[PDB]
Design a protein around this nucleic acid. Structure first.
Length: 160
DNA sequence: CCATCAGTGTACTAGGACCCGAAAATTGAGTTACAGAAGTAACTGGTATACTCTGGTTTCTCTTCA
């Protein structure tokens, strides 16, 4: 069944997870969007033929699209935008209020827990997961260990 | 040079009042009984602080004997 907001922005209606995964794998069935492969002049011609086949255009038009839509750090930042200006001001104020300016232990902790296993390939390739496996991001609320854990409920999230 | 030892830069508590909304509960009117208790709303004595002549007083010349 379709997941839809039961509450405006807090909660969905009860829906079967298997049905939802099947809807998704049905709408992406054999479209090449669920690959789980790593990202890889002769290929240019095949790509242009594919674009001509999928967009009903000419090989010349496909090559033109491939050329024009091409992709289009350095800490210096000038000629700012709104949020870029806010970031510049924040950076300058931090440069004068802080003396060591390195990632706090909680920042590195949250990051190194989040990005602990990303792109980690299976050693066996027999425990490789199938294309389309519906990872659920549960988060289990810690019990009330400290008294203040009633106010702001700490949780640990698991990618089931 | 590897010991030691403040500071530091933060999310994570610790008290510490305080607030926001929801849900339950009450209040309120309407009736009609019921008995009795509050709850004012009414006339009717009762005794004191001024008060107003008044009864006595007081010299002060005189009245009446003596």
């Amino acid at each position: 069944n379709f997941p839809e907001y039961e509450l405006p922005e807090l909660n969905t209606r009860a829906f079967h997870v298997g049905a939802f995964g099947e809807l998704w794998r049905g709408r992406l069935r054999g479209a090449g969007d669920l690959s789980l492969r790593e990202p890889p002049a002769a290929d240019s011609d095949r790509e242009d033929a594919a674009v001509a086949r999928d967009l009903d255009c000419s090989l010349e038009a496909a090559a033109e699209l491939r050329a024009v839509c091409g992709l289009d750090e350095v800490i210096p930042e000038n000629t700012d935008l709104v949020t870029l200006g806010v970031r510049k001001r924040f950076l300058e104020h931090r440069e004068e209020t802080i003396t060591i300016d390195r990632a706090c232990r909680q920042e590195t902790f949250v990051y190194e827990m989040e990005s602990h296993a990303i792109g980690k390939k299976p050693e066996n390739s027999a425990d490789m997961i199938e294309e389309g496996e519906l990872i659920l991001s549960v988060n289990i609320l810690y019990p009330v260990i400290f008294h203040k854990h009633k106010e702001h409920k700490p949780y640990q999230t698991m990618l089931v």
